[PDB]
Amino acid sequence: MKLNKYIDHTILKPETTQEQVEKILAEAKEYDFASVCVNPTWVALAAESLKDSDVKVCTVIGFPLGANTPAVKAFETKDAISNGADEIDMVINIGALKTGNYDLVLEDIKAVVAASGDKLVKVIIEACLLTDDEKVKACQLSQEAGADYVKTSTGFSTGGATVADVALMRKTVGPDMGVKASGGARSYEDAIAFIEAGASR
Template identity: 80%
Template structure:
């Protein structure tokens, strides 16, 4: 059984330094995979550089472990969903995910379709 944990829960508002620390600590304690929540506030305010560097910090801290980026799609416009997926891909993550299950909605067929169209078949 693989162990996965989430960093930056629930809205990704912690700093990149904290997320990287959480990632390293989780791996040291046996995590095989890391789910991270993007900084929703930064994305919505247009600070794309912060979102990308935030994801990259977790990817770098994870070493060879899988990193899955949760975009919390129910809080985003379609344009923001596309941007979030592009940033996750550019920063080197392995997967994109729709939601934490904490907010107002979960996965929808339309969101999954949009995310797949954005990242293509080679990214989970």
């Protein structure tokens, strides 16, 4: 129970204005959600809005395509933290993973984690573009590189979280790593199903 703390109040559409972000922040305080998720450009604003609030400021790194260099994702992480971010969601280098360049994927995630400091890092693996072997390998690489969560989706691709995917990730990273279901409409029914599949906080 207490489903409100399973909700990351998210707004990441490119056309998003300040008014809409402020509306999201207001709703987040009023309904006491776990966090707000904004693009880096709003982090500062969010940080100022939620400084007296259990609600965390979450932002996205190398988002949503994850096709940046590790140096740039690291820099964007440290910048986001300097601007007031509490959590870091990065997008895995999907292309490198599909290429079989696991060394670069690992370097990438480690680059982001190193810059993170005491802040938690979630790695969006973008499951809808992956084979099952690639999902497993993405989660293993995420755990080895020292990430705290694996996340299903950006919400900007062909599909979001599936029960099978969530269960598979949970199986892969064990019980002590976070598994977040993202992407989708998304109804509370979906959230219940994902939690039952092994999704965490």
